[PDB]
């Protein structure tokens, strides 16, 4: 499919940035997670980034560490996450769905088989958090064979070699974690990279507008959504209300 290509074309026509929330699948349980995700979409999420709970998320800070613990407390497994993904796609045909994975979960039962399952359930992209471009060949190859975009992080300590590699290897979007910001964005465009989404510390509307102004195609909220879940565990209803209020405000800022 071409879900990211179609999204960016549509946003470009509307002179609009993308806003993309992250959440952990199955946090704080399967039923509530499904409701959270539908709320994010209804509130104006342009795409989703979805984590599969992993025992050792060595690229994640405390907010997401705790989301994983909550999901594990609920007994969530990767198999259950894939059942969830199929149901999400069945409800929402056009929204791009990206996974944020750890390498062991991709490799566990075979890299090719992982990306084949992604394709079967209708996933659009996979970012493997602990696979740098240097180690990415078998992941990128399997992704592309199954019509999945391999997503790469362009970090704050990127150099020109890395920019060229990310531009060459990535698809869907480039995950920017931000050399000056203007430099990175212009250089990615120069090298025909997948459109850049700013992912560093996106927790307020002002940061969404700022990302768009800098020349990025939008912004990813890496942990702010999870923080809202954490804060509202005792009140599922209030949780959904705050999630809706937050996503609506973040999306409004992309215009």
């Amino acid at each position: 499919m071409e879900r990211y290509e179609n999204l960016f074309a549509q946003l470009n026509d509307r002179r609009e940035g993308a806003f993309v929330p992250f959440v952990t699948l199955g946090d704080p349980g399967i039923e509530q997670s499904l409701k959270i995700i539908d709320t994010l979409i209804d509130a104006g999420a342009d795409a989703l980034e979805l984590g599969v709970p992993f025992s050792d998320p060595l690229a994640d800070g405390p907010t997401i560490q705790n989301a994983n613990l909550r999901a594990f407390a609920a007994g969530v497994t990767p198999a259950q996450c894939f059942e969830m993904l199929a149901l999400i796609r069945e409800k929402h045909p056009t929204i791009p769905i990206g996974l944020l994975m750890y390498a062991n979960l991709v490799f566990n039962n075979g890299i090719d088989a992982f990306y084949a399952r992604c394709e079967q359930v209708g996933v659009d992209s996979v970012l493997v958090a602990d696979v740098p471009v240097e180690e990415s060949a078998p992941f990128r190859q399997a992704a592309l064979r199954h019509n999945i975009a391999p997503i790469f992080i362009c970090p704050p300590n990127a150099d020109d070699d890395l920019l060229r590699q990310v531009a060459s290897y990535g698809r869907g979007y480039t995950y920017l974690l931000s050399l000056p910001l203007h430099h990175l964005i212009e250089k990615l465009k120069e090298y025909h990279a997948a459109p850049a989404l700013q992912g560093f510390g996106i927790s307020s509307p002002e940061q969404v507008s700022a990302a768009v102004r800098a020349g990025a195609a939008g912004a990813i909220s890496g942990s702010a959504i999870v923080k809202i879940i954490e804060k509202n565990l005792a009140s599922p209803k209030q949780m959904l209300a705050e999630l809706r209020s937050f996503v609506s405000a973040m999306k409004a800022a992309s215009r």
């Binding site: 992993f54 025992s55 050792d56 998320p57 060595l58 690229a59 800070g61 405390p62 560490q65 613990l69 497994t77 990767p78 198999a79 750890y102 390498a103 062991n104 979960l105 490799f107 566990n108 039962n109 958090a129 602990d130 696979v131 740098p132 471009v133 240097e134 180690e135 790469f152 992080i153 362009c154 970090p155 704050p156 300590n157 990127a158 890395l162 974690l177």
Partner: protein, 395 residues
């Protein structure tokens, strides 16, 4: 691009977030430079000799082999300053930190021996040391935590995940990703992302080099086999490295069998786990069927690393080294036997290596064999654990 090969066959690599790649590349360049620098080598030699106490003895153990055709030597890393082999490579890594202009050290520890080694090296060389340790480990290793603190290190309990060594490993990598401009990550075993398996081997290889010279002096020939416990792989690869090209010399690594392999309560991923990708490397892992990383179980706190160094996985795959396991009960017997018959209290980790040598002897007592066991540490730290077991049994 790297200067050195990050893989040992299919095993190893650099499976870290992109943000950490510059730190690994910087460390590899510094190491390659250091290895060609006579000034660095002389400083390292000076610390090993005059601070840590190298060379360590090679002790012939006559009582325990009586009435058999086994001759057994113990390489005495238990006599190194700090009480284990961990001291050797921390001194080398602390010098690399300084070479790179770093003023801070991060280290992970499970049982606490690597944490103590990191803290002592940091104190001597004027580095600010912080040690991550799983909260469950902190709770059960109050003595080592206190030594670390006396030596001026910050000990940071890790409550994420299982609150054990793997979780401390993650936290150290998280910190380093943000701090690598000023901090060096002093990884404690021959595992993790390249270049750590290479650096740790080269900074432990004097174990085997000395052993070779000592056995040539005393016996006029190489050993039939050298035997070492394997938690993450540092003491074993340190003993093995200089013998790899001596194809007659057996290389035997001993993983913890815990309550028995068949119980699943063990720490023997090289022979009984499954290859996965975690902690920066592709290697045999303790993991669930769906790929969650699990803990290693052993009597011995130090054989808790839930994977194994990639060079061990490679040496096994080609048949150059052989790996076996020893249960808690077998290790405990070996511990008791060495105390009573040689007057040496061995670490329970090292007791696994000794137990396998005793099995080699006892199974075939008329086989002529010249064995060396790497005695990776002293077992003062283990006397309470051993006391508690013997009481529970009724001994």
């Amino acid at each position: 691009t790297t200067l050195l090969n990050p893989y040992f066959g299919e095993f190893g690599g650099m499976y870290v977030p992109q943000i950490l790649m510059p730190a690994l590349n910087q460390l590899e360049e510094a190491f390659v430079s250091a290895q060609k620098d006579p000034e660095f080598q002389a400083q390292f030699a000076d610390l090993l000799k005059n601070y840590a106490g190298r060379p360590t003895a090679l002790t012939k153990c006559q009582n325990i082999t009586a009435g058999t055709r086994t001759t057994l030597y113990l390489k005495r890393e238990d006599l190194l300053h700090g009480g284990a082999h961990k001291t050797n490579q921390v001194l080398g890594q602390a010098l690399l930190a300084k070479r790179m202009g770093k003023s801070e050290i991060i280290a992970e520890t499970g049982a606490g021996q690597h944490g103590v080694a990191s803290a002592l090296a940091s104190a001597l060389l004027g580095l600010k040391c912080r040690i991550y340790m799983g909260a469950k480990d902190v709770e059960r290793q109050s003595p080592n935590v206190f030594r670390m603190r006396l030596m001026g290190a910050e000990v940071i309990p890790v409550h994420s995940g299982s609150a054990t060594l793997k979780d401390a490993c993650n936290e150290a990598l998280r910190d380093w990703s943000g701090s690598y401009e000023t901090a060096h990550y002093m990884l404690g075993t021959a595992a993790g992302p390249h270049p750590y398996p290479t650096i740790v081997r080269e900074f432990q290889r004097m174990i085997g080099e000395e052993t070779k010279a000592q056995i040539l002096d005393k016996e006029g020939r190489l050993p039939d086999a050298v035997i070492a416990c394997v938690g993450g792989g540092s003491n074993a690869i340190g003993m093995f490295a200089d013998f790899i090209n001596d194809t007659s010399v057996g290389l035997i690594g001993v993983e913890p069998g815990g309550h028995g392999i068949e119980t699943g309560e063990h720490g023997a991923p090289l022979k009984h786990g499954r290859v996965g990708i975690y902690f920066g490397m592709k290697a045999p892992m303790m993991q669930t069927a769906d790929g969650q990383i699990e803990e290693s179980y052993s009597i011995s706190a130090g054989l808790d690393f839930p994977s194994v160094g990639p060079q061990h996985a490679y040496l096994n795959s080609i048949g150059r080294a052989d790996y076996v396991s020893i249960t808690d009960d077998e290790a405990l017997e070996a511990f008791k036997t060495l105390c009573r018959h040689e007057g040496i209290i061995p670490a329970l980790e090292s007791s696994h290596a000794l137990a396998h040598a005793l099995k080699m002897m006892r199974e075939q007592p008329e086989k002529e064999q010249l064995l060396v066991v790497n005695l990776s540490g002293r077992g003062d730290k283990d006397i309470f654990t051993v006391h508690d077991i013997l009481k529970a049994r009724g001994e």
